């Protein structure tokens, strides 16, 4: 156990992201398009897979 | 205590260490836990010497030790001999042995009073053992095992011998040594008991894989309680 607030603060940077389906890039959670050129700024995004 | 110790992963402590009543010898290339076991259990009353014999980390199989004396092979250098002479107390006598078998821990199984040797040793070496150690000597094999030092663990209180030993050989050796002997295993069933562990009057050090019934047999036969 870390602490509940400290787990929230660490998960803000480590777990509450989104993943581009084409190029696996770690993206902002409210993003609409990937920031990478190689996937062509696609809008195929998924949430980052949580535990539990 | 039969103290669980490893030599960097090695569960054979008799190979890398030689323990008597008066002194202890440990290899120079040893871990902090391995040194800390002898330092905590032995205390400050008994000197612990970090030594190398003949350029080898193995010292228990190279040397045969007693409270009165220590025997070293011919290949031991003058620097190691002088370091042992300075580090050891004045009571013990260190003498080089010039003998072909040259691995005195494997050749000789000895305690304070009585010793078992390899049958084929030279007579000058037998007289040298009787002189320096002050110990009466028998040439005998443990159920056909000529390496009595590797295949027997011996102290003043009792002895552990090879597991595959004839019972008749057990009472014969027990009457010859005037101590009770038990056939048993050490280090999760390893046959080489003398290489497996070191023992004296109040301490036994063994490998970590030595199981609880084996450790109970050790403390029972060596009366360490």
């Amino acid at each position: 156990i870390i602490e509940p607030s400290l787990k929230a603060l660490a998960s803000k940077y480590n777990c509450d992201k989104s993943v581009c389906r084409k190029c696996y890039a770690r993206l902002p959670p409210r993003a609409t398009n990937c920031r990478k050129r190689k996937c062509g700024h696609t809008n195929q995004l998924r949430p980052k897979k949580k535990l539990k | 205590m039969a103290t669980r110790t490893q030599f960097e992963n090695s569960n054979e402590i008799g190979v890398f260490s030689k323990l008597t009543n008066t002194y202890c010898l440990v290899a120079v290339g040893g871990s902090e836990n391995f040194y800390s076991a002898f330092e905590a259990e032995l205390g400050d009353a008994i000197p612990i010497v970090h030594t190398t014999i003949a350029g080898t980390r193995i010292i228990g199989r190279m040397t045969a030790g007693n409270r009165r004396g220590l025997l070293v092979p011919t290949q031991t250098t003058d620097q190691e001999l002088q370091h042992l002479r300075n580090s050891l107390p004045d009571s013990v006598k260190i003498q080089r042995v010039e003998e072909r078998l040259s691995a005195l821990g494997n050749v000789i199984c000895c305690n304070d009073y009585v010793a078992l040797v390899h049958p084929d040793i030279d007579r000058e070496t037998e007289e040298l053992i009787s002189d320096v150690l002050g110990v009466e000597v028998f040439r005998q094999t443990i159920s056909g095992n000529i390496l009595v030092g590797s295949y027997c663990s011996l102290s003043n209180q009792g002895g552990l011998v090879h597991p595959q030993t004839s019972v008749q050989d057990q009472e014969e050796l027990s009457s010859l040594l005037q101590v009770p002997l038990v056939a048993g295993t050490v280090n999760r069933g390893s046959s080489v008991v003398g290489a497996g562990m070191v023992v004296n009057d109040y301490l036994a050090v063994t490998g970590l894989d030595t199981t609880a019934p084996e450790l109970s047999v050790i403390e029972s036969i060596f009366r360490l309680q």
């Binding site: - | 205590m1 103290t3 669980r4 836990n33 109040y202 019934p213 109970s216 403390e219 029972s220 309680q225």
Partner: protein, 468 residues
Amino acid sequence: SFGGINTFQQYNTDLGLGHNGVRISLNYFDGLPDPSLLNSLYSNELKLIFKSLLKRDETTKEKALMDLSNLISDFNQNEYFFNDIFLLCWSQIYAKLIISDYKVIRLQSHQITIMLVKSLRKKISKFLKDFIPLILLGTCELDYSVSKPSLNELTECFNKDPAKINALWAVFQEQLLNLVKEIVVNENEDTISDERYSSKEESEFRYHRVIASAVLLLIKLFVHNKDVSERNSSSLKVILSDESIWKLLNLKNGQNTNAYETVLRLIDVLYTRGYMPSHKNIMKLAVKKLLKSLTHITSKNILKVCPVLPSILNLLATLDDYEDGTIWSYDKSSKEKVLKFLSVSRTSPSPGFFNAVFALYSSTKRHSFLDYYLEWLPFWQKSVQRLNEKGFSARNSAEVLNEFWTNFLKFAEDSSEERVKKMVESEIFNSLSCGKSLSEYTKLNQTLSGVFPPDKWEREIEDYFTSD
């Protein structure tokens, strides 16, 4: 950092050994420190030490203990670290630590507690009640090595005042007894040691070792406090009723007869106290076990059990005296067991064992437990005859043979039978004839003069000169 709550312990509302609001128990499953309490600890360094202590591996446990000790050494720097919270936690773990198989762990744990008290003197008073019994158990343990240093240290802690040490026994007698009770009745061998990592044996061995220490503790406690029996009778009855203490007296198997000796001493103490008479049923239960013990003693293990035998016999004489060999009376086969025992005992005779046997004989004749001519005298003749074979090849046998002769002469004086005296004379001559050195056993020879009269010996010399 620490999570979870000990709800089950809360339902129980039992403080176990502890008087400070924390359950303290020897058993592995419970008494582990509460996570909330652990969180409360003053420093991260302490918290880690505790987590390591919880872990199963010994090397880690030792490492943590060493670290804790180092922190205590710098008390001034770490005084803030040590707090009631620390004390509550240490106490809970300390109990489990004292039962540890590894000697170093036990020794270090005891040393740490004593050090803490010395530094925190007069600040550990609330916690003293929990700690003192445990500290004492360490001071009174079958292994000399753990107990002796612990004892010396305890004395230094109290400024080397013997009175204080005795005072502890008096002041905490109720607490001490509670500890003994918990080991004997509340605990079981399985509870003490986890089954997966421990066999049926060893666990059994362990429970016995711990209980043996408890019996040892009781003996000192009884000696220290006379009224302890009266004040603690209800609890004492419970402790005695349990078969566990009685199970301890097994010589059939087991490495240490030291444990067995301790139980005998307790039974002896109980009879001397009159507590055993007070609860006759308890005395009977002990007697039955003593009878079982006789069967256990056997030729195969005679060498192993030989030092313990003289003691058994001396105790037997005292117990038999009570209620007219009432102890013998309970068992129909008591005589049968004795007969078997005698044969086994005679084959190997301990030094001083025969003196004990004569004392038993002094007791037996009054209640006529045994027929002297058919059984006692002949068995003795067999025993000396056996000794004659054992003439004196090994050490001490020489002392034992002389010892037997002293006893045998006494046996004969009681016999008042012509045949017996004649038999003695024949044996005496034969013993000399078998040979040994009179000079070597000079003291024995001086004792030996009675068998051949001084004038007879001069006549004996004339007969010897005549001999071819």
